[PDB]
Write a protein that binds this ligand. Sequence first.
Ligand SMILES: O=P(O)(O)OC[C@H]1O[C@@H](n2cnc3c(-c4ccc5ccccc5c4)ncnc32)[C@H](O)[C@@H]1O
Ligand SMILES: O=P(O)(O)OC[C@H]1O[C@@H](n2cnc3c(-c4ccc5ccccc5c4)ncnc32)[C@H](O)[C@@H]1O
Ligand SMILES: [Ca+2]
Lengths: 136, 140
Amino acid sequence: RPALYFCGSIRGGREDRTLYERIVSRLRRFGTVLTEHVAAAELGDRLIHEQDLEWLQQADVVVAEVTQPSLGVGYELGRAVAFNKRILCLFRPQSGRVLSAMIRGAADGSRFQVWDYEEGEVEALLDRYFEADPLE
Amino acid sequence: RPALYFCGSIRGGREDRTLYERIVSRLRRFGTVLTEHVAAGEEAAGGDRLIHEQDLEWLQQADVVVAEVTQPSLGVGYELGRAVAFNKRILCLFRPQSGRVLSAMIRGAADGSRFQVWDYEEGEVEALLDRYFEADPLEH
Ligand SMILES: O=P(O)(O)OC[C@H]1O[C@@H](n2cnc3c(-c4ccc5ccccc5c4)ncnc32)[C@H](O)[C@@H]1O
Ligand SMILES: O=P(O)(O)OC[C@H]1O[C@@H](n2cnc3c(-c4ccc5ccccc5c4)ncnc32)[C@H](O)[C@@H]1O
Ligand SMILES: [Ca+2]
């Protein structure tokens, strides 16, 4: 099965955890979600970084929920771009916040895309994304 | 003259901007600081894609990357990720008095030599930068 790497804020703040839960659940339909407890309710920094970096290199796609600002999510995206990974970022404008110019500016609109969305449609958007370019 | 890349939160929040100006001012003692914008309208800057492209050019030019990582920020984390993949000399500065616990990805990326993370209190930041470059002078 293909491998997916999901990114979402933890020490940046866990406001969106229930949404991360939904996203991870839907991503699993398309392959193994290596990071499936960015979403765990009850949540060796070197060991964490090394295991995550192993996972990131094996991933066939990186999906990041980037509404909550987070050093770790940004770092994962930076490493992912340097690995030239396929990357999808998901951002919610209804938060009132404006997304980092660095993340929106890193997008090229094909291999690295940033999609604005509202919470209710996120499963349908993931379905759309992977039907247009399947992971094999 | 050596070049320095400074990272600090902007859209992650600007509460530490006056601290960023202090850090940028002190970094000028050691070479050219390429990113004074952190301590200083986005279409006036050329739009987000051109902001990203200019910063990445500067990051590749940099002889050292210094990041104030107390305020969580996607951009700062992204710059650090790109810097690690470029194998840059990296110093991160974090203030535990903020009340925060630093990202495990940033604390855990450190190896204690080429990528270091230093906990500090705001008053001493100039003396710590002096110490850092006195022990290991900046090479271009
Ligand atoms: O914490 P942030 O917001 O800077 O960064 C979050 C991002 O960075 C990765 N990350 C951050 N903290 C992580 C942890 C973690 C966090 C807190 C912990 C507390 C106690 C013990 C273990 C812990 C592990 N585990 C796995 N990945 C993590 C993660 O994949 C996520 O997408
Ligand atoms: O905005 P963040 O917190 O995700 O990321 C901040 C980091 O990412 C880089 N970065 C982020 N926004 C930047 C901008 C920029 C320029 C004009 C703007 C106008 C309005 C709002 C934001 C703007 C940002 N310029 C240059 N570098 C930027 C920067 O070097 C900094 O270290
Ligand atoms: Ca395919």
